[PDB]
């Protein structure tokens, strides 16, 4: 993509029903990549850092 | 001029000589530095020793004590240490204390934290200046406000007046409102710190505030410098109804920010370029006339601004003459810049999908549907017209 | 000439490598001692580090009480929350610690050598404090209507209290200062300030709010103690709906850590104790959101509004910041003023400061008609419209 | 019907919100040119986006209220102002039109007419309930001594006689612009007061001499609605010579 | 970033527009067809006999969750458990569906997903 | 809940994978703890019962210490149920994280994330 002389897409959003598996499917491509797996909800479900990874964005 | 530049060099020789000087040759002769010298080399490094808890200084007080506090859970107010000086210590940064017993050895560290990491953004960007065209007559103004007093503050401060500020970037979105702020950054090299509107407005409670100092305070320290603040409108927009701080901390934030900007602060060198959706749909707490002089208001792209942009995004994707950018630009209505980069962007993509590294007349083609529809599309309007 | 002009690159490297010596001797890093003060200070030092007068860990006495073992005994808590019963160290007298008052006790050996400073807890506060500030006064419009108005309340006591005594007038307390952004509540004040000459703390109380709930109201009360200690005090808060918003609750909210600063300031003011004579300000972004405490007369005697600055406010803001400015003699300056729509008081002045840009864009030692045209008809159409006062005015 | 709280306030910024709102949905929008003849007066706006799918009939910005008196609306913003906030002034001056046009025995003063139209999209900011247009009209029509006008009027109902008036593109750019192509001697005859109005459409339209969309109107005959295709061929004519300008 | 969003009203302006969000992707609600393969793949970790009766339970549930396909496998195992079968049998997965079917309903009737 | 503990080898050789935790949902009083307290009667045994207002001590450090010896337990005795209560003042989505109680309630949730995949 570089190569070709475009900018990379910042944003992906998935869409639709939480019930076609469609969130399960969304996690898969996370496990598949062996991504770290970083989950920010905008609350601080267990996030250590300062203690908050929701506004840690830089 | 060039007889200045001997008079500067004058203080300058003379700081490094004479502080080699005198260390090494004032120990040897009489008793000068002597017994003295070594006394507060020793007496700092021993009690220093084996740990030193870190802590923060806080507050230095006029009776040779100060409050540290420390980083091991205790506040102290410490008693300064023979041959250390308490006015060396700086509020911006921390200090290094003796962990046995509490008083100030020294600073060998100012620390740093994560907080001071958001404001500071490093740009280089693939995009810049002269890879915009059309729309000549807005970056001039854009310039006239940030460039022309930031580099020579000198009349501008001594007329009377206080220096123009910034510019508000408002009008159709998608003009190129981000990539103007970048490129005028890098032609007046200001230090370019981005932080959006709605980082600000946070779960923590009584921490959205403080980081707007911050905000500000850094980008003084840098010293020439532009803040860009992108998505400002955001703060407005929203009531979130989704952070703990609540409407509380909506309201808080938004002060912090006027009293930062000017207030009875009035800081100088700190231009904010402002970048929103439109400023009416901003809060009009932070909108008001006077703190930024010029407003800027982009008309919608016409076909003819148009081709100057994708000629250069062109040049940056695979050449062939499949490439045909009259075509795409001709069918489209007059709206945004922004279309021109997202037409160049997808005809890659597509490509992709297809198994070929090669960007035809095809991929661009199929790029026109989604980018048109998604944008503004041109069917509902059609019958208005 | 060629010879010294080498040593500009020079001396650069020249420090770096020095740098552990330079450290040691002058200060910063390695070895940090400044040589001037911390040398004259060394005899006094020498006591301190001898005695275990370090540590002398932060605390407050809540009572203290003396009991037996070791016979004179203090009861503190620390600022960390947790209390220790502590000893005297022979350095001062029972009677210099007191019941309530900021105390020192060390960490590795709790006793009293010198008792803390009470009342300076706020750092973040003192973090925005600059003391007599202003822009210039030629901004202002000068003497206004508006100004002379709070000269009358606020200068006055500071300068003489012997003149109201003497008359025999309570002295003033509250001026209320209202009117949506940009209409110059801070910049009067200022003004005024600068002028009784009193010392002037203003402070934005988005700072007096920080951590929970009851940690902010500390902060105010002591602040507001402590510059009502001090004789000729002038305190202007500036922009309160951050300690100064609505009350209510919903229960699905709550207005209560802003509400608990809020009452906590306007409790403090008169008092329950009849008055000062230290003046307080209060500046508010809406006049939409004050409980009728603080409207009281001894804690509001007169309600001044800056508000969309007067009808001879206008003309003078122009003329006095076009006075100061290099500008044209042959427009105007009402005229220009009087085209600005129901003109904000930041209003006014951004038509000067867009018509001395272009002026001082072209290096004239004056400016022109043209400057003066594209700026007025700009201001007039735009600016106004996008101000801060059409969207205010009507909910206030 | 009307609602209870009303639109339109007096508020501070100087005029009003709904025509500070106003002014700015017809700066935003395309190009709406008229220009007066000494033959026929002609109006013609930049956009219809015509493209051989549809037709026009009473889909034309320019409609006729009377016999010799027309308007051309440029309701028309940054995402397209409404066709129907014109059709509401169209409706009420139409039969104030003809009823003035029975009682003059010649072609129908324009003058009436316009200060009528002024007065309209005024009394909605006054009354209750209700707001001003978003558009800016071109009332043009003869009078009883059979004297051309082109008139204008702005979305709260200010109203001048103009020898050539343009709106929309920021109306003062286009307007000064119309003076530079207006001639005296380039409205002698039909054709060339035609060519005029054209001239300033071109400057910035989509897909010229489709969308572009001019009717005509004689001395008390009927407007005669000409179709894109019609339009085309003067189109060609002057976006040559235009060309050979430069 | 992968979000994942149940709307397309959950978004933000400046994620519709394109220049920095090159596509955004559709899932469907659960289809009878899809519901086959997810199905036989779970079934596979169970014993099956002489007959093809995947379409026909598959045809049976409306769904509501990939844990509700799981379900009629693991369900089929507790009933021969149960019963002290020595293989998986197609009568099984016939009582199981059924079961998983009536479990679907409640919550159909309460207005609920698989979270209460 | 009750077979595989009886006999793993049958609960395993039907086609359903190896014990895994089971999640009870639903609105109050409508015996999600009550099926599995029932249960855990008839047994006698196979059934750790821990409060999860257990896992928190008073002084800091000791609260995730807790949770893995007592989950560990289960391990060693094999198969064996970690039943809690009420699972939440602990499974909170939302932690303040700046004092040192908030502190506290963050860790024991981390280390049970941690142990889940443990047993």
Same mark, same amino acid.
């Given at each position: ?58 | ?84 000086? @308490? ?50 007559? *807005? ?92 998505? $400002? ?70 076909? @003819? ?5 994708? *000629? ?27 279309? $021109? ?45 | ?72 005994? /203090? ?307 735009? /600016? ?13 | 019907?009307? /609602? ?66 027309? %308007? ?86 200010? /109203? ?87 | ?93 016939? %009582? ?21 | ?119």
């Amino acid at each position: 993509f570089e190569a070709l002389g475009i900018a990379q897409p910042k944003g992906v959003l998935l869409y639709g029903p939480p019930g076609t598996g469609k969130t399960l499917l969304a996690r898969a491509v996370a496990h598949h990549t062996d991504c770290t797996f970083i989950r920010v909800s905008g609350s601080e479900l267990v996030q250590k850092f300062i203690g908050e990874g929701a506004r840690m964005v830089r | 001029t060039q007889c200045r530049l001997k008079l500067l060099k004058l203080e300058r020789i003379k700081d490094y000589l004479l502080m080699e000087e005198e260390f090494i040759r004032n120990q040897e002769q009489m008793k000068p530095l002597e017994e003295k010298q070594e006394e507060e080399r020793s007496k700092v490094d021993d009690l220093r020793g084996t740990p030193m808890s870190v802590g923060t200084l806080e507050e230095i007080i006029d009776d040779n004590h100060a409050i540290v506090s420390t980083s091991v859970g205790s506040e102290h107010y410490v008693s300064i240490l023979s041959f250390v000086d @308490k006015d060396l210590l700086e509020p911006g940064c921390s200090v290094l204390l003796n962990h046995k017993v509490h008083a100030v050895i020294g600073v060998l560290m100012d620390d740093t934290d994560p907080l001071v990491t958001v404001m500071k953004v490093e740009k280089a960007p693939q995009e810049t200046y002269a890879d915009i065209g059309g729309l000549d007559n *807005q970056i001039q103004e854009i310039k006239e406000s940030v460039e022309l007093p930031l580099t020579h503050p000198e009349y501008y401060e001594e007329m009377g007046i206080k220096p123009p500020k910034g510019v508000i970037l408002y009008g159709p979105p998608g003009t190129g409102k981000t990539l103007l702020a970048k490129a005028v950054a890098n032609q007046t090299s200001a230090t370019f710190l981005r932080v959006v509107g709605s980082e600000l407005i946070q779960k923590y409670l009584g921490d959205g505030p403080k980081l707007v100092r911050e905000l500000f305070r850094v980008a003084e320290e840098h010293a020439p410098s532009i803040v860009f603040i992108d998505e $400002i409108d955001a703060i407005g927009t929203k009531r979130y109804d989704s952070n703990s701080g609540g409407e509380r901390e909506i309201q808080r934030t938004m002060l912090e920010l006027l009293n930062q900007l000017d207030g009875f602060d009035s800081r100088g060198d700190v231009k904010v370029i402002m970048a929103t959706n439109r400023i009416e749909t901003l809060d009009p707490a932070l909108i008001r006339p006077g703190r930024i002089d010029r407003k800027i208001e982009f008309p919608l792209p016409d076909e @003819k601004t148009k081709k100057r942009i994708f *000629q250069i995004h062109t040049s940056r994707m695979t050449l062939a003459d499949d490439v045909t950018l009259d075509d795409l630009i001709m069918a489209k209505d007059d709206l945004s810049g922004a279309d $021109i980069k997202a037409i160049c962007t997808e005809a890659g993509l597509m490509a992709l999908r297809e198994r070929r590294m090669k960007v035809t007349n095809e991929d661009f083609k199929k790029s026109k549907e989604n980018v048109l529809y998604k944008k503004q599309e041109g069917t509902p309007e059609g019958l208005y017209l | 000439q060629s010879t010294y002009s080498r040593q500009i690159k020079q001396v650069e490297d020249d420090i770096q490598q020095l740098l552990k010596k330079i450290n040691e001797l002058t200060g910063i890093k390695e070895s940090d001692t400044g040589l001037a003060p911390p040398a004259l200070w060394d005899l006094a030092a020498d006591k301190q580090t001898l005695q275990s007068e370090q540590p002398l860990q932060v605390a407050r006495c809540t009572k203290i009480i003396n009991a037996d073992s070791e016979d004179p005994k /203090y009861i503190i808590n620390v600022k960390q929350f947790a209390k220790f019963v502590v000893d005297l160290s022979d350095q001062v007298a029972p009677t210099d610690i007191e019941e309530g008052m900021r105390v020192g006790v060390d960490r590795n050996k709790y006793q009293i050598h010198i008792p803390l400073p009470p009342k300076i807890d706020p750092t973040v506060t003192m973090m925005q404090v600059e003391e007599k500030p202003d822009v210039t006064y030629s901004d202002v419009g000068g003497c206004k209507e508006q100004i002379e108005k709070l000269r009358e309340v606020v200068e006055t006591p500071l300068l003489h209290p012997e003149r109201f005594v003497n008359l025999g007038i309570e002295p003033p307390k509250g001026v209320l200062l209202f009117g949506p952004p940009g209409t110059g509540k801070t910049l009067c004040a200022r003004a005024v300030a600068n002028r009784t000459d009193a010392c002037f703390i203003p402070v934005i109380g988005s700072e007096l709010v920080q951590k929970y709930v009851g940690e902010g109201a500390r902060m105010v009360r002591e602040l507001f103690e402590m510059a009502r200690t001090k004789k000729a005090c002038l305190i202007f808060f500036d922009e309160i709906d951050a300690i100064g918003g609505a009350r209510f609750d919903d229960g699905a909210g709550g207005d209560n850590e802003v509400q608990r600063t809020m009452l906590e300031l306007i409790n403090q003011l008169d008092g329950f104790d009849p008055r000062g004579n230290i003046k307080v300000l209060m500046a508010t972004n809406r006049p939409d959101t004050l409980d009728p405490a603080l409207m009281r007369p001894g804690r509001l005697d007169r309600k001044i509004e800056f508000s969309l600055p007067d009808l001879e406010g206008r003309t003078h803001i122009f003329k006095i910041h076009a006075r100061s400015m290099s500008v044209e003699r042959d427009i105007r300056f009402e005229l220009l003023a009087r085209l600005c729509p129901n003109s904000t008081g930041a209003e006014i002045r951004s038509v000067c400061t867009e018509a001395g840009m272009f002026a001082i864009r072209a290096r004239r030692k004056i400016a022109t008609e043209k400057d003066f045209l594209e700026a007025v008809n700009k201001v007039i159409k735009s /600016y106004a419209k996008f101000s801060a006062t059409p969207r205010y005015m009507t909910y206030n | 019907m009307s /609602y209870d709280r009303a639109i339109t306030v007096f508020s501070p910024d100087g005029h009003l919100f709904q025509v500070e709102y106003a002014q700015e949905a017809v700066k935003k929008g395309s190009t709406a040119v008229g220009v007066r003849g000494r033959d026929i007066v002609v109006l013609g706006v930049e956009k219809k986006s015509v493209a051989k799918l549809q037709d026009e009939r009473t889909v034309r910005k320019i409609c006729a209220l009377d016999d010799n008196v027309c %308007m051309a609306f440029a309701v028309v913003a940054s995402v397209s102002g409404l066709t129907a906030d014109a059709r509401i002034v169209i409706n009420r001056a139409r039969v104030e039109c003809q009823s003035h046009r029975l009682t003059v025995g010649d072609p129908v003063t324009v003058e009436y007419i316009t200060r009528y139209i002024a007065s309209l999209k005024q009394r909605y900011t006054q009354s209750n309930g209700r707001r001003p247009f978003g558009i800016s009209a071109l009332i043009v029509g003869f009078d009883f001594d059979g004297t051309p006008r082109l008139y204008q009027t702005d979305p709260s109902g200010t /109203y001048h006689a103009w020898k050539a008036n343009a709106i929309g593109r920021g109306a003062k750019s286009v307007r000064e612009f119309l003076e530079k192509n207006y001639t005296d001697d380039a409205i002698e005859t039909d054709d060339l007061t035609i060519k005029l109005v054209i001239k300033a459409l071109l400057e910035v339209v989509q897909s010229g001499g489709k969308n572009i969309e001019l009717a005509v109107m004689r001395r008390d005959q009927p407007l005669k609605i000409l179709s894109p295709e019609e339009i085309e061929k003067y189109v060609a004519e002057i976006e040559k010579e235009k060309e050979e300008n430069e | 970033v992968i979000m994942a969003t149940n709307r397309i009203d959950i978004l933000d302006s400046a994620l519709l527009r394109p220049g920095r969000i090159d596509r955004k992707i559709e899932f469907p609600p659960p289809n009878e067809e899809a519901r086959l393969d997810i199905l036989k793949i779970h079934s596979r970790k169970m014993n099956l006999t002489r007959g093809i009766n995947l379409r026909k339970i598959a045809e049976l549930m409306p769904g509501a969750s990939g844990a509700e396909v799981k379900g009629v496998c693991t369900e089929a195992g507790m009933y021969a458990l149960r019963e002290r079968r020595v293989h998986v049998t197609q009568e099984d997965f016939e %009582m199981a569906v059924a079961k998983v079917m009536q479990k679907d309903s409640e919550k159909n009737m309460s207005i609920k997903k698989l979270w209460k | 809940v009750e077979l595989p503990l009886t006999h793993f080898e049958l609960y395993k050789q039907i086609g359903i994978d190896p014990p895994r935790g089971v999640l009870m949902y639903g609105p109050p009083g409508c015996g999600k703890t009550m099926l599995a307290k029932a249960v855990a009667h008839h047994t006698t045994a196979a059934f750790i019962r821990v409060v999860g207002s257990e896992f928190v001590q008073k002084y800091l450090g000791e609260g995730p210490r807790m949770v893995r010896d007592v989950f560990r337990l289960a391990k060693e005795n094999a198969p064996a149920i970690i039943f809690i209560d009420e699972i939440d003042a602990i499974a909170t989505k939302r932690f303040d994280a700046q004092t040192g109680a908030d502190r506290e309630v963050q860790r024991i949730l981390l280390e049970l994330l941690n142990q889940m995949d443990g047993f």
